């Protein structure tokens, strides 16, 4: 009856193996090695993060005291509200200029899925026939929408202009760059213009304009390379946020070869073409100017977290040494 089984070490449950046991000198000095790496790293972040200079304006005019209050319910030609801010300390290096929002749920499930990734990939076939996922903004008066979905419908369209008033009767138009603010794999891989000739008016033949927009997508920017679906201000908005309070890149403020404070100390004015109505749902708008660093941004949560984790872990390697000593060779 079924002659003897084989003697191979797997079948006999005797495979070669390492048997680890949590001794005193194996889990006691791991609560210290961590405690001497997490505190130094938690100070390097905090000290570095403290020296990035950052300013926020919050130009939403909910209060009657703000000059932008005159355009909450406009009825005339586009508004222009001006805010005066001052850089009490200078900015050096390169400067990034973002814009922020709040109570804007770009992670809502009814809103995240409302796009058509085939169309945005320069597909010659589905361009004339958007998918059903964008149903509120899928069709118009017998014409399909080129940027389809509820994501591209609500694109941010406020215009921000920065002026250095170092002397009156000459507000300096500080130079802002609008190219190079998108993921390098979005401008060259994920977003592509339809494969036509050299006129974007013919590539978008027969397709309408988004309901909430003012000009068709084939004239978003005058740069013939940066126009249409490959637009960079368009790409940044399409890349949705993860939390209700976010910020998105707007422009770059390059520096010059001569060592100068790219944004010099003094007073400034921000000239805003108020268009985007966030006040209906308790929204808030902001303009943010920040500087760079070799570590990251002004992120002080990690700096405090490592100091707190690196100390609690340290204060466990002590209370696990007055107990191990007391309870060993004993009860």
């Amino acid at each position: 009856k079924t002659r003897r089984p084989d003697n191979t070490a797997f079948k006999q449950q005797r495979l070669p193996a390492w048997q680890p046991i949590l001794t005193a000198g194996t889990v006691l000095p791991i609560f210290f090695i961590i405690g001497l790496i997490f505190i130094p790293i938690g100070i390097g972040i905090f000290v570095t993060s403290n020296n990035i200079r950052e300013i926020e304006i919050d130009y939403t005019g909910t209060e009657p005291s703000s000059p932008c209050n005159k355009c909450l319910s406009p009825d005339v030609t586009p508004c222009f509200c001006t805010i005066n801010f001052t850089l009490e300390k200078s900015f050096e290096g390169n400067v990034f200029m973002y814009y922020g929002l709040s109570n804007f749920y770009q992670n809502h499930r009814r809103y995240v899925k409302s796009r058509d990734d085939s169309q945005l990939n320069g597909d010659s076939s589905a361009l004339l026939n958007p998918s059903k996922e964008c149903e509120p903004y899928r069709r118009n008066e017998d014409k399909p929408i080129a940027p389809c979905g509820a994501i591209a419908n609500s694109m941010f369209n406020d215009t921000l202009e920065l002026f250095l008033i170092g002397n009156d009767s000459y507000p300096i138009p500080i130079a802002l760059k609008k190219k190079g603010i998108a993921w390098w794999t979005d401008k060259n891989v994920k977003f592509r213009n339809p494969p036509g000739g050299d006129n974007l008016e013919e590539r978008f033949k027969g397709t309408t304009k988004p309901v909430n927009w003012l000009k068709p997508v084939y004239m978003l920017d005058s740069d013939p390379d940066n126009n249409g679906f490959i637009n960079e201000d368009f790409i940044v908005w399409m890349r949705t946020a993860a939390l209700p309070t976010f910020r998105k890149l707007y422009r770059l403020i390059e520096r010059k070869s001569d060592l100068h404070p790219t944004l010099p100390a003094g007073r400034y004015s921000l000239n805003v073409t108020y268009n985007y109505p966030v006040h209906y749902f308790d929204g808030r708008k902001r303009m943010i100017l920040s500087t760079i660093s070799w570590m990251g941004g002004k992120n002080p949560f990690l700096g405090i977290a490592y100091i707190a984790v690196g100390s609690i872990s340290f204060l466990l390697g002590v209370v696990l040494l007055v107990i191990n000593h007391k309870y060993r060779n004993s009860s």
């Binding site: 990034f96 770009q106 992670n107 995240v112 190079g180 603010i181 998108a182 993921w183 390098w184 890349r239 949705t240 946020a241 993860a242 939390l243 309070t245 976010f246 910020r247 890149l249 770059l252 920040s290 760079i292 660093s293 990251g296 941004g297 002004k298 992120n299 002080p300 949560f301 990690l302 977290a305």
Partner: peptide, 19 residues
Amino acid sequence: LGAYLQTVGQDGEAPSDYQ
């Protein structure tokens, strides 16, 4: 979530999206 309510990058390659 604590690290994303603030910035994590600046260069414009900065990942702060939902992806």
